[PDB]
Amino acid sequence: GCNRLNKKCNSDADCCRYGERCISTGVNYYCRPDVGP
Numbered sequence: 001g002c003n004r005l006n007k008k009c010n011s012d013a014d015c016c017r018y019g020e021r022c023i024s025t026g027v028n029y030y031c032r033p034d035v036g037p
Contacts, residue, residue: 004031 002016015031023032
């Protein structure tokens with residue numbers, strides 16, 4: 001239950017750490033989906 005995906009994050013802490021995580025989309029870090037469970 002997390003949906004801050006495709007938003008820019010300063011860190012993992014800006015979004016969920018499970019299901020979401022900050023990956024680099026090139027220039028900036030966005031919260032990208034992780035499979036989670």
